[PDB]
PDB file of C-alpha atoms and ligand atoms in Angstrom:
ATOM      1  CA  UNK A  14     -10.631  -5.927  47.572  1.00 21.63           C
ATOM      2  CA  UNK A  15     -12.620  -2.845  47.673  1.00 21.47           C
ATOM      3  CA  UNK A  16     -12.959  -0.205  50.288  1.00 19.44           C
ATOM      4  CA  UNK A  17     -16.398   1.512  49.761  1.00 21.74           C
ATOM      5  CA  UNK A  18     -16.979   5.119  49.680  1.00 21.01           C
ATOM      6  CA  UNK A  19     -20.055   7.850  48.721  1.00 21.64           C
ATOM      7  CA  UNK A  20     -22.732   7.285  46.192  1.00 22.17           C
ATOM      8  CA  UNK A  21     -22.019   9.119  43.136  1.00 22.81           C
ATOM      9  CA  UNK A  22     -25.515   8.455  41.451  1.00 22.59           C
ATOM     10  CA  UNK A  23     -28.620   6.416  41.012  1.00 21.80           C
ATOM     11  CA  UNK A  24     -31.104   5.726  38.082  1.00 23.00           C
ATOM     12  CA  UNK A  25     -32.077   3.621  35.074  1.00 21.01           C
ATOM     13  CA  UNK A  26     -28.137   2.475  35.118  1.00 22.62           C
ATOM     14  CA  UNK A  27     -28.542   0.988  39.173  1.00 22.70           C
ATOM     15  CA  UNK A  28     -26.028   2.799  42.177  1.00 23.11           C
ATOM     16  CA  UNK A  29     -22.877   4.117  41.340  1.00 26.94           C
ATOM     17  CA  UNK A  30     -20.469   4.379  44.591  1.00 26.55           C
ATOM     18  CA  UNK A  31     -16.633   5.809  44.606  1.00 26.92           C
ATOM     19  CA  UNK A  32     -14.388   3.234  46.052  1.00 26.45           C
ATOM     20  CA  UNK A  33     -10.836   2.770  46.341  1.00 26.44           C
ATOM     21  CA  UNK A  34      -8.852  -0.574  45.200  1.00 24.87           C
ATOM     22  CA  UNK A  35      -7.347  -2.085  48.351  1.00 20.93           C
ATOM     23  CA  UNK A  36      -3.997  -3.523  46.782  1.00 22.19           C
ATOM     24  CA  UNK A  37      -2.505  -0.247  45.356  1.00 21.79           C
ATOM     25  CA  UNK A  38      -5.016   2.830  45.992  1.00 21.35           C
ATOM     26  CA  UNK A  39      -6.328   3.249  42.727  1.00 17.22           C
ATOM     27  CA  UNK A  40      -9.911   5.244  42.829  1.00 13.94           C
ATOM     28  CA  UNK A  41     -12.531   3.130  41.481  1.00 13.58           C
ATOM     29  CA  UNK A  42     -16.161   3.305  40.866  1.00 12.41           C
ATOM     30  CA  UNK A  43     -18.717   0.800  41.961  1.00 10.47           C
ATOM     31  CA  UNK A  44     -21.410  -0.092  40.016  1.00 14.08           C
ATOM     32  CA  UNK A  45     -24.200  -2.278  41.341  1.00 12.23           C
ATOM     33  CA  UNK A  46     -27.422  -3.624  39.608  1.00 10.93           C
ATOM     34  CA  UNK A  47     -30.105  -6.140  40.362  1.00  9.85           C
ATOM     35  CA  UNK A  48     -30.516  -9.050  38.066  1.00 11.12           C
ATOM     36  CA  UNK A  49     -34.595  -8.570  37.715  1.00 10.09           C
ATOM     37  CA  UNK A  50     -34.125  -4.615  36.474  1.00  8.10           C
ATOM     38  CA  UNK A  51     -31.671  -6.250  33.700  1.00  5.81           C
ATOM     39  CA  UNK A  52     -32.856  -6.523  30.289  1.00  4.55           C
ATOM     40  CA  UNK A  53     -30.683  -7.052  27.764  1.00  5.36           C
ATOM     41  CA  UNK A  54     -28.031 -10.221  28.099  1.00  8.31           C
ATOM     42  CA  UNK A  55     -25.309 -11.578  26.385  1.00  8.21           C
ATOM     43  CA  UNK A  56     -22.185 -13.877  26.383  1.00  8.92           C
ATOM     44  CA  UNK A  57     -18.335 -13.718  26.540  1.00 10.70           C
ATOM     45  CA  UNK A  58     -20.963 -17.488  29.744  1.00 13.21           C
ATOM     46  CA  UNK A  59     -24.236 -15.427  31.028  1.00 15.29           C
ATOM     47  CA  UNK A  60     -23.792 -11.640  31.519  1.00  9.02           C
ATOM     48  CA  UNK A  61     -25.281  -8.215  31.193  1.00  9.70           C
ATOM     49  CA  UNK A  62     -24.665  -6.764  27.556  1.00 10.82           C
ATOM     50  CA  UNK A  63     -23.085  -4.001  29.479  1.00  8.31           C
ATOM     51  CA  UNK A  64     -20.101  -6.207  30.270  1.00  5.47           C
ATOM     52  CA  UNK A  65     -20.000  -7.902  26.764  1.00  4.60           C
ATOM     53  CA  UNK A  66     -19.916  -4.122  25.091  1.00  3.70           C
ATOM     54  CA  UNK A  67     -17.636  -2.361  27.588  1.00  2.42           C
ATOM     55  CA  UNK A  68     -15.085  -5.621  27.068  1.00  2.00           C
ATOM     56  CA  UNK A  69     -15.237  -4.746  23.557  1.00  2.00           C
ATOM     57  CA  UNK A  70     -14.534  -0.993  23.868  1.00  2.00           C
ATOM     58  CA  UNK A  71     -11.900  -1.530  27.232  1.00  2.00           C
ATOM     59  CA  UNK A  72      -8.836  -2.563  25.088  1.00  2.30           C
ATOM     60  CA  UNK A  73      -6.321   0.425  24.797  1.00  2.00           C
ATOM     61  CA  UNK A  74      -7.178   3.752  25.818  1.00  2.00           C
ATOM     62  CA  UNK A  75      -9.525   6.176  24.419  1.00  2.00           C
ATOM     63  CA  UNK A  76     -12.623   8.360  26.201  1.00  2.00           C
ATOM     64  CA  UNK A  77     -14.293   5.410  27.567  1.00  2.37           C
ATOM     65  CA  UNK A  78     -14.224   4.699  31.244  1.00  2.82           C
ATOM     66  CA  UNK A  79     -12.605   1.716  31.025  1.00  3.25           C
ATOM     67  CA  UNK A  80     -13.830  -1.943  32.874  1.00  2.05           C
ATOM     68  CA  UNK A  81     -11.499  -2.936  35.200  1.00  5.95           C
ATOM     69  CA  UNK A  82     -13.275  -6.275  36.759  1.00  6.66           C
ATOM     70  CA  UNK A  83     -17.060  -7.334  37.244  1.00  6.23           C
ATOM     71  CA  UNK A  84     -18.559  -9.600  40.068  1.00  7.99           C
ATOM     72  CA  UNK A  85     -22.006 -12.002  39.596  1.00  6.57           C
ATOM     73  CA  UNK A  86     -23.843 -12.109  43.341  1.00  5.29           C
ATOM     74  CA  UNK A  87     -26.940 -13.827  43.578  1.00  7.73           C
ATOM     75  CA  UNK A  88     -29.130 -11.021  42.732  1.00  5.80           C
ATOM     76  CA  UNK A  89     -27.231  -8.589  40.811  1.00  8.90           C
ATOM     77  CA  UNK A  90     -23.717  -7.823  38.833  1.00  8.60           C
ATOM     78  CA  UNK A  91     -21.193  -5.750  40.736  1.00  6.56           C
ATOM     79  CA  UNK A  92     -19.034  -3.995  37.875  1.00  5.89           C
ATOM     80  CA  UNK A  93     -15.417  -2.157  38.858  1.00  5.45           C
ATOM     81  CA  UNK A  94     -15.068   1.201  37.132  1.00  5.70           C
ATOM     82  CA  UNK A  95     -11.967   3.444  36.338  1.00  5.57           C
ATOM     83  CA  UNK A  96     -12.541   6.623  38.162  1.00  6.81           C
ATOM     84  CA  UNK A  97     -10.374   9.526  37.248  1.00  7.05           C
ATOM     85  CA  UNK A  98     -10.269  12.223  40.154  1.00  8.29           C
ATOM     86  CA  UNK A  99     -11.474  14.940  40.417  1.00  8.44           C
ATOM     87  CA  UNK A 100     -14.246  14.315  38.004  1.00  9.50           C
ATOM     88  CA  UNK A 101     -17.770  15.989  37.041  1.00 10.79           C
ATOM     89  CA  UNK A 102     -20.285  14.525  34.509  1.00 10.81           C
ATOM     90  CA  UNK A 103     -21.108  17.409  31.769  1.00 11.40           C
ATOM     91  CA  UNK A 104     -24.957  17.969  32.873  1.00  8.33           C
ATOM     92  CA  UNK A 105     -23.224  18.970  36.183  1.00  9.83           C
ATOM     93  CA  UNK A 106     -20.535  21.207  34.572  1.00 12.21           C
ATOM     94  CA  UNK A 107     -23.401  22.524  32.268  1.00 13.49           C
ATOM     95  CA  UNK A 108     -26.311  23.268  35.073  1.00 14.54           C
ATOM     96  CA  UNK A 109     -23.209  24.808  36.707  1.00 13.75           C
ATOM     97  CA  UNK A 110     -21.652  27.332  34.256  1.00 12.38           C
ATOM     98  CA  UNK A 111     -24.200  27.462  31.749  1.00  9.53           C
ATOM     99  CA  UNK A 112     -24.245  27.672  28.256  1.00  7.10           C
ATOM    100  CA  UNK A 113     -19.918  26.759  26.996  1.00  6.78           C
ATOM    101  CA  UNK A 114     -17.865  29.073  25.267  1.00  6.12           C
ATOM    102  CA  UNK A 115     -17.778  27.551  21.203  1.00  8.31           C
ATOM    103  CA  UNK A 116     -14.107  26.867  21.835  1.00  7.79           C
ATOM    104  CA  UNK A 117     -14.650  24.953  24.616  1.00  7.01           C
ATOM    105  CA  UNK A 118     -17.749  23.075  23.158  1.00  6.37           C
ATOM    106  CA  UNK A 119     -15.457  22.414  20.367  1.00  5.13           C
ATOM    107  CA  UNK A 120     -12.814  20.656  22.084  1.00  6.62           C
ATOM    108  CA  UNK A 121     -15.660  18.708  23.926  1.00  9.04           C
ATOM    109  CA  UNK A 122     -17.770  17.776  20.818  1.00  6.77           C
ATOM    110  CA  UNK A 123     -14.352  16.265  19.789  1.00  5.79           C
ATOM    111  CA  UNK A 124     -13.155  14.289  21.894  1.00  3.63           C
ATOM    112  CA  UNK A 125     -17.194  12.890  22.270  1.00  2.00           C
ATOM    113  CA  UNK A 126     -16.638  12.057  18.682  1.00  4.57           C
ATOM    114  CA  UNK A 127     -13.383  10.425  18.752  1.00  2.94           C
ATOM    115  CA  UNK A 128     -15.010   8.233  21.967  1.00  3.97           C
ATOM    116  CA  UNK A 129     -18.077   7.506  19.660  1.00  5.34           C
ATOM    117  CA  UNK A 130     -15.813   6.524  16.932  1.00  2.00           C
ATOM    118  CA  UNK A 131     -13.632   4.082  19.301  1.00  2.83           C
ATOM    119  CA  UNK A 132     -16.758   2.403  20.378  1.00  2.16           C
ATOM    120  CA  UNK A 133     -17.902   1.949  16.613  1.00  2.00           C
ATOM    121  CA  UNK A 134     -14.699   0.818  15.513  1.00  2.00           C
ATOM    122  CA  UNK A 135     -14.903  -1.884  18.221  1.00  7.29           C
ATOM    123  CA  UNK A 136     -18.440  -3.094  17.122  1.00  9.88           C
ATOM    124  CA  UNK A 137     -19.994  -1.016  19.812  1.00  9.40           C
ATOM    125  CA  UNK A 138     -22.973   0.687  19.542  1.00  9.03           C
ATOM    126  CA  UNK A 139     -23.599   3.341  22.909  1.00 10.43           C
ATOM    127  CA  UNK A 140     -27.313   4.612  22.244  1.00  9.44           C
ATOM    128  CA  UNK A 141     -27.530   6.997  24.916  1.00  5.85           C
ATOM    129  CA  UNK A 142     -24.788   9.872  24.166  1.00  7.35           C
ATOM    130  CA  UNK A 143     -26.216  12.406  26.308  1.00  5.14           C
ATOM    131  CA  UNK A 144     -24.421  15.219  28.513  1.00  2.48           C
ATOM    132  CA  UNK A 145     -24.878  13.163  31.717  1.00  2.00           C
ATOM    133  CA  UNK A 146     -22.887   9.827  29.963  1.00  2.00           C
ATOM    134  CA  UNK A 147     -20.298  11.933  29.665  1.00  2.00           C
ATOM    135  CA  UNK A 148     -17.359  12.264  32.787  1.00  2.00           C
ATOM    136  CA  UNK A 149     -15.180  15.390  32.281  1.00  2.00           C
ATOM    137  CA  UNK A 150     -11.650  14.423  33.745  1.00  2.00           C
ATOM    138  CA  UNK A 151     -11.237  18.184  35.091  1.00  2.00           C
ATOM    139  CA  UNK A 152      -7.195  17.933  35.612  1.00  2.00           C
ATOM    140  CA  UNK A 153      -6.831  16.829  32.403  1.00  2.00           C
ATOM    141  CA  UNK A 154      -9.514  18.170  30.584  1.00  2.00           C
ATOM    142  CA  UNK A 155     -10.112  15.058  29.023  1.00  2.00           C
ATOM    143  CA  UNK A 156     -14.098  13.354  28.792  1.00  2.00           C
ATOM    144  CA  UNK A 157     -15.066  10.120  29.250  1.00  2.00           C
ATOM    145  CA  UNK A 158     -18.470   7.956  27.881  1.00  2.00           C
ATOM    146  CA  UNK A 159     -20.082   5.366  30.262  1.00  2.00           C
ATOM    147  CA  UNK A 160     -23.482   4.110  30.465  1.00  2.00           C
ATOM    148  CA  UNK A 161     -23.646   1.075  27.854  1.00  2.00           C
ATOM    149  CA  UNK A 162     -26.377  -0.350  29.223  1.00  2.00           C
ATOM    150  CA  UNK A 163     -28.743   0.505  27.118  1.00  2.00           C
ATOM    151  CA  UNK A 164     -26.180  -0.070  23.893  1.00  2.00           C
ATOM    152  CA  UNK A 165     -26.103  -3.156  21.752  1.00  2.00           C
ATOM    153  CA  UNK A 166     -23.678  -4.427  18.821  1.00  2.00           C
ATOM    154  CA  UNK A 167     -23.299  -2.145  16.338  1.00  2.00           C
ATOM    155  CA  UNK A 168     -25.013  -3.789  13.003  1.00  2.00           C
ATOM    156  CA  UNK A 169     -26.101  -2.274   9.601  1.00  2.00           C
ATOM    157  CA  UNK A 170     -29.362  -3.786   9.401  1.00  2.00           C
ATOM    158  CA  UNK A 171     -32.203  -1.866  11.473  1.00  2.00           C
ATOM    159  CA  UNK A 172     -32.948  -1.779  15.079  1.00  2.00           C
ATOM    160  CA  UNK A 173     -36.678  -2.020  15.954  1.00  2.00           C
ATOM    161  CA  UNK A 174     -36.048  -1.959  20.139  1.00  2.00           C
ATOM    162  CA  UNK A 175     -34.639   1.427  22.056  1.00  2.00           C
ATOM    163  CA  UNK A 176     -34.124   2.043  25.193  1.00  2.00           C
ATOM    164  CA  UNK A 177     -32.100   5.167  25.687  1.00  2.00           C
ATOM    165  CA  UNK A 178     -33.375   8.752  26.510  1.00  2.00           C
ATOM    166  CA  UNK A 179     -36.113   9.775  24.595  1.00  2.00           C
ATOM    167  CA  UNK A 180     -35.666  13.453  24.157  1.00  2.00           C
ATOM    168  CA  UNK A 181     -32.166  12.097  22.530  1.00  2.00           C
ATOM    169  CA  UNK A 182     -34.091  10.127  19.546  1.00  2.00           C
ATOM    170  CA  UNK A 183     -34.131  10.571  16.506  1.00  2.00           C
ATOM    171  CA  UNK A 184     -37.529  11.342  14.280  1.00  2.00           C
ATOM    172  CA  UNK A 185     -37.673   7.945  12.850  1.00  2.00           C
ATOM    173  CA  UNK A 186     -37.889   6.416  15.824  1.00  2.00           C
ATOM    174  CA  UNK A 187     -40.590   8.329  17.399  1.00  2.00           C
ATOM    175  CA  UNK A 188     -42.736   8.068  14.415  1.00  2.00           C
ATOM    176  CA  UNK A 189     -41.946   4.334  13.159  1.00  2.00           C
ATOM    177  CA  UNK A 190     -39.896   2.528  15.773  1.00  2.00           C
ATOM    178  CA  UNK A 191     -36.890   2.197  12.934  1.00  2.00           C
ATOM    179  CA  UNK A 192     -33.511   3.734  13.079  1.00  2.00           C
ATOM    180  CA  UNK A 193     -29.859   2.381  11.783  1.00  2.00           C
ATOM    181  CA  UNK A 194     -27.078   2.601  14.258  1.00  2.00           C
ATOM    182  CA  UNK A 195     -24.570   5.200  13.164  1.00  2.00           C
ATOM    183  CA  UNK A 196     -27.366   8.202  11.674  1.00  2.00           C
ATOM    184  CA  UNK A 197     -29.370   7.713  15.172  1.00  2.00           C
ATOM    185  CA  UNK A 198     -25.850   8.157  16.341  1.00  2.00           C
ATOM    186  CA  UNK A 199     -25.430  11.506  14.518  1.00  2.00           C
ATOM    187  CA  UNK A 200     -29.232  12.751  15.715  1.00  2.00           C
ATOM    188  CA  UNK A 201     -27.770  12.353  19.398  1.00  2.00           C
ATOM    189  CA  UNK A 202     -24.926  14.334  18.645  1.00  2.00           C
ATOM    190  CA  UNK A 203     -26.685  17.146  16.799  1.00  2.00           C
ATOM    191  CA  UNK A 204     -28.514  17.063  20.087  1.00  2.00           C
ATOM    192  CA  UNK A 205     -25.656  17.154  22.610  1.00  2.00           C
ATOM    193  CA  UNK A 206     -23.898  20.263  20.439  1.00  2.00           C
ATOM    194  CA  UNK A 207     -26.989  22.240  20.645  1.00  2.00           C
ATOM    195  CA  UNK A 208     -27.378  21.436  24.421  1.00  2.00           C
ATOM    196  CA  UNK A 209     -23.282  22.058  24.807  1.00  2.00           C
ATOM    197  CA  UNK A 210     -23.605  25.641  23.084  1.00  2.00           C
ATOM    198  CA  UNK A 211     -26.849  26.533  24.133  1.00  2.00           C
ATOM    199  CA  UNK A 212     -27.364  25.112  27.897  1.00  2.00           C
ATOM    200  CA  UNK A 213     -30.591  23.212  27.368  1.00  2.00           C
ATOM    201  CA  UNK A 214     -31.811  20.514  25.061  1.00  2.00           C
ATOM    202  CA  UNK A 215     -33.649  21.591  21.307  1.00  2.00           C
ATOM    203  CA  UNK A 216     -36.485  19.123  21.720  1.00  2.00           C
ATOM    204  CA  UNK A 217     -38.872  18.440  25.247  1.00  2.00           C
ATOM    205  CA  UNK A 218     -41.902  16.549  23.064  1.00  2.00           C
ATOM    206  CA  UNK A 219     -42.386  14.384  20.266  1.00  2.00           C
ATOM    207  CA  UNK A 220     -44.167  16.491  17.882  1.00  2.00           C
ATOM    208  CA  UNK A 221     -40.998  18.736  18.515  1.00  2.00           C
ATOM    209  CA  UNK A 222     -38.923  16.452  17.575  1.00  2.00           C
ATOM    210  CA  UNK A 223     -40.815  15.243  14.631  1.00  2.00           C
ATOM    211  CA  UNK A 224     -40.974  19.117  13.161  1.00  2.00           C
ATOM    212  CA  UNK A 225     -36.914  19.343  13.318  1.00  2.00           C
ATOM    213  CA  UNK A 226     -36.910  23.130  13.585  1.00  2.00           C
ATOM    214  CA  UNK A 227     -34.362  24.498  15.210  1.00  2.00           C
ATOM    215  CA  UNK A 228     -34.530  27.483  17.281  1.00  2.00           C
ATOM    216  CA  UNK A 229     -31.482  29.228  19.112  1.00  2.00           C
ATOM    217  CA  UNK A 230     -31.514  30.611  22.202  1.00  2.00           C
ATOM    218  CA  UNK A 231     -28.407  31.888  22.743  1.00  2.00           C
ATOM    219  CA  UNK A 232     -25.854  33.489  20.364  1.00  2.00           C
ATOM    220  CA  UNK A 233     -24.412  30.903  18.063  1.00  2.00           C
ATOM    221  CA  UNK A 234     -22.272  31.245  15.272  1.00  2.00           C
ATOM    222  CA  UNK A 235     -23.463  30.262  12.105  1.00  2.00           C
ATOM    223  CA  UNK A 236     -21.054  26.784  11.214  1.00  2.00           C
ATOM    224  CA  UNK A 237     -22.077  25.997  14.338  1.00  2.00           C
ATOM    225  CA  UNK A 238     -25.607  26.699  13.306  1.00  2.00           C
ATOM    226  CA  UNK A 239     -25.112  24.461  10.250  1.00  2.00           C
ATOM    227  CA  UNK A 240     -23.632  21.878  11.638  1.00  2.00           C
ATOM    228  CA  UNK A 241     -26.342  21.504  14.742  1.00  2.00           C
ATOM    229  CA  UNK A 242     -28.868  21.596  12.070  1.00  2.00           C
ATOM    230  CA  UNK A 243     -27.427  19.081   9.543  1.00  2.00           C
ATOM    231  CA  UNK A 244     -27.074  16.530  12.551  1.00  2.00           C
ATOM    232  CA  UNK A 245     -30.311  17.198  13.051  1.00  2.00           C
ATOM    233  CA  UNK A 246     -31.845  16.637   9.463  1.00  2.00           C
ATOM    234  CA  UNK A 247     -34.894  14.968   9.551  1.00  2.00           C
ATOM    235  CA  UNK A 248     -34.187  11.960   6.670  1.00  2.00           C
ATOM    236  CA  UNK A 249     -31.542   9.693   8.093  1.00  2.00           C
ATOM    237  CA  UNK A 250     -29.391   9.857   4.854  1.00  2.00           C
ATOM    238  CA  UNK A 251     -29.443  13.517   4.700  1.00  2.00           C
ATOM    239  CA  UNK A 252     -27.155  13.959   8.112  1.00  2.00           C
ATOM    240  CA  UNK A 253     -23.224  13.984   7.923  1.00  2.00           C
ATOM    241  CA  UNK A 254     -21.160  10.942   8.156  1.00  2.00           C
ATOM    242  CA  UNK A 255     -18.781  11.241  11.152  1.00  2.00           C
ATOM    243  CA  UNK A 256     -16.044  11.999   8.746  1.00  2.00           C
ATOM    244  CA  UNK A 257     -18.429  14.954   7.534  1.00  2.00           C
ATOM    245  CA  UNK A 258     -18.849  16.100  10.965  1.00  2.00           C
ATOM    246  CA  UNK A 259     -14.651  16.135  12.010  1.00  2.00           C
ATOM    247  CA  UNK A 260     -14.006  18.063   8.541  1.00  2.00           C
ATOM    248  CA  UNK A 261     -16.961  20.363   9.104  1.00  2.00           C
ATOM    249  CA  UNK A 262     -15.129  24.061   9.035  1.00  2.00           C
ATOM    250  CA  UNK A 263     -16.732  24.590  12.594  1.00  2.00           C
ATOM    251  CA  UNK A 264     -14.712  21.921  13.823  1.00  2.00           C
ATOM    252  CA  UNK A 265     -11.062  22.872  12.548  1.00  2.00           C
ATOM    253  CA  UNK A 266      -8.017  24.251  14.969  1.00  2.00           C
ATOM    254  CA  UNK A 267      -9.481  22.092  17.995  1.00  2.00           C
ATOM    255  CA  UNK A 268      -7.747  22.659  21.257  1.00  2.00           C
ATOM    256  CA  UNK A 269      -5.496  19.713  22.502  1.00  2.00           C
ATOM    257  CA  UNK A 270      -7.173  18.172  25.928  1.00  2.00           C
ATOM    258  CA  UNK A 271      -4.107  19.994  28.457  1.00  2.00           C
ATOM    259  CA  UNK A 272      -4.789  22.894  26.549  1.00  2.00           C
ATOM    260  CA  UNK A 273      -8.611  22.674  27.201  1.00  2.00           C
ATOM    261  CA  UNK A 274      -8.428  22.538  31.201  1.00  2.00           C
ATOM    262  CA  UNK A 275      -5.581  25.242  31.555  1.00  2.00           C
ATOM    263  CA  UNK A 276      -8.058  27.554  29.585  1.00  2.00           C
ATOM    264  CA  UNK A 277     -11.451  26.902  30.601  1.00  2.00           C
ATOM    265  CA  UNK A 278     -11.364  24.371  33.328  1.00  2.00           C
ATOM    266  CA  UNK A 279      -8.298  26.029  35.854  1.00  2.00           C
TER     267      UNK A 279
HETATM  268  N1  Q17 B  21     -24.506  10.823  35.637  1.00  2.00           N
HETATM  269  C1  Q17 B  21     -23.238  10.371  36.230  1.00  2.00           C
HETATM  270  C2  Q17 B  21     -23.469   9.219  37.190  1.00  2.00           C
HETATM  271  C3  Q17 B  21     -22.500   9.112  38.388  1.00  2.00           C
HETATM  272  N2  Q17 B  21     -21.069   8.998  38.106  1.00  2.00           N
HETATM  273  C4  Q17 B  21     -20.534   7.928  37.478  1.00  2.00           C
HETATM  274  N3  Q17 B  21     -21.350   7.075  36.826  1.00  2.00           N
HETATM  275  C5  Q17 B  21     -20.832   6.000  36.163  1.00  2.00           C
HETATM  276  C6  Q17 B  21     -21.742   5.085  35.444  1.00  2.00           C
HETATM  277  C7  Q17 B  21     -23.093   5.373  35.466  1.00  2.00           C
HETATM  278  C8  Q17 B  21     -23.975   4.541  34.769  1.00  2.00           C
HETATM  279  C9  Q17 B  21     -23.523   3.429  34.062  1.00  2.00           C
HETATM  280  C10 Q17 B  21     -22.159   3.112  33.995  1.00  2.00           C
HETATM  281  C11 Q17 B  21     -21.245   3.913  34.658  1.00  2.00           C
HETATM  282  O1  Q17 B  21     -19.915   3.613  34.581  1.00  2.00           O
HETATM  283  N4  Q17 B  21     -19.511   5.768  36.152  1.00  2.00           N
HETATM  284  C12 Q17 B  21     -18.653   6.598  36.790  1.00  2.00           C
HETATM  285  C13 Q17 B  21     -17.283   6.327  36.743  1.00  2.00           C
HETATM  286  C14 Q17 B  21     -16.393   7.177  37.409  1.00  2.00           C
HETATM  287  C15 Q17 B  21     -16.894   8.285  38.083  1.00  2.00           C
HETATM  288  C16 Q17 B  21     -18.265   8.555  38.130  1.00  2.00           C
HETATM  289  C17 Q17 B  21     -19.152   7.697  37.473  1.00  2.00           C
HETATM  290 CA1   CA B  22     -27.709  32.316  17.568  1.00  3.70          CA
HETATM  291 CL1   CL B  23     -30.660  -1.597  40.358  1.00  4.28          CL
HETATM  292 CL1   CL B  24     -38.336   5.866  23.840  1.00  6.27          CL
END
């Protein structure tokens, strides 16, 4: 069914390859990963949560890589990946060209958003929204969120277990293992726009990111300023609501996806 091509990564997630779909051509990607480094399981029948959540979040279209099929081997789950081509995750694009232009980080931080939205709207909570879960479709400037395998159904009652990348938590977790769903969310994203705008992440430790103060680097505007820093308020119920966020005056006049890669990514 599958013709087999490079690796395209390796970590916490298990091997990523590029492969091609036999039948009609289409460019896939290949994700393998052994049963015993699985954690977290779930049902439609036995599976990874990964599969249950990115069923959930597959209907439609949106910026998700979408599931396309799955395999169960004896010692790990095979999982069949859209793959748009060509393709570059954003730590790539961001160790590459530095710190992004506020128009571009704009349009990015967007369409992030709308993705994160999608997935909550589907029950879906991601938990690691970081620059390398993100796939930049550079033809059509559009970006795509994988990696749910550290995410979990979205719920309004508190999570006491995390998984995800550290340096991406928020306060309350570090200091009292306690965090709801959608304000962690928000913390994450204050995160990726400061990392998007300034080329490097806010926080390395966690007495860093228990003081919340925010330093910039590079020249930022000040509504982007303000809205990095209201992300990143310390008390969960002082950050902005998602619909906060889309109607904050930094993010206003966005650029259309097409519009995006014939300016900055051409
Ligand atoms: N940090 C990026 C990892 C390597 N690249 C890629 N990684 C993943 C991927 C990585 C971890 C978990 C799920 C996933 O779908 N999916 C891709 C789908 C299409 C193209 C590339 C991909
Ligand atoms: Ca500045
Ligand atoms: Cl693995
Ligand atoms: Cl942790």
């Amino acid at each position: 069914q599958y013709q087999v091509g490079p690796l395209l990564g390796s970590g916490g997630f298990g091997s990523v390859y590029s492969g091609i779909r036999v039948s009609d051509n289409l460019p896939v990607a290949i994700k393998h990963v052994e049963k015993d480094r699985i954690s977290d399981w779930g049902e439609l029948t036995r599976v990874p949560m990964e599969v249950v959540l990115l069923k959930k979040v597959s209907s439609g279209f949106s910026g998700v890589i979408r599931l396309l099929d799955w395999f169960e081997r004896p010692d790990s789950f095979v999982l069949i990946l859209e793959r748009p081509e060509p393709v570059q995750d954003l730590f790539d694009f961001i160790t590459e060209r530095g710190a992004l232009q506020e128009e571009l980080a704009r349009s990015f931080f967007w369409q992030v958003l709308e993705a994160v939205r999608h997935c909550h709207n589907c029950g879906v909570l991601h938990r690691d929204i970081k620059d390398e879960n993100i796939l930049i479709d550079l033809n059509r400037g559009e970006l795509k969120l994988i990696d749910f395998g550290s995410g979990a159904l979205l719920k309004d009652t508190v999570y006491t277990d995390f998984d995800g990348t550290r340096v991406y938590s928020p306060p309350e977790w570090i200091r009292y293992h306690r965090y709801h769903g959608r304000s962690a969310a928000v913390w994450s994203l204050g995160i990726l726009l400061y990392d998007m705008v300034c080329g490097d992440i806010p926080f390395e430790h966690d007495e860093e990111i228990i003081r919340g103060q925010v330093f910039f680097r590079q020249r930022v505007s000040s509504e982007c300023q303000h809205l990095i820093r209201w992300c990143l308020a310390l008390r969960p119920s002082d950050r902005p609501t998602f619909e906060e966020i889309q109607n904050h005056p930094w993010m206003q006049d966005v650029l259309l996806p097409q519009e995006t890669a014939e300016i900055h990514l051409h």
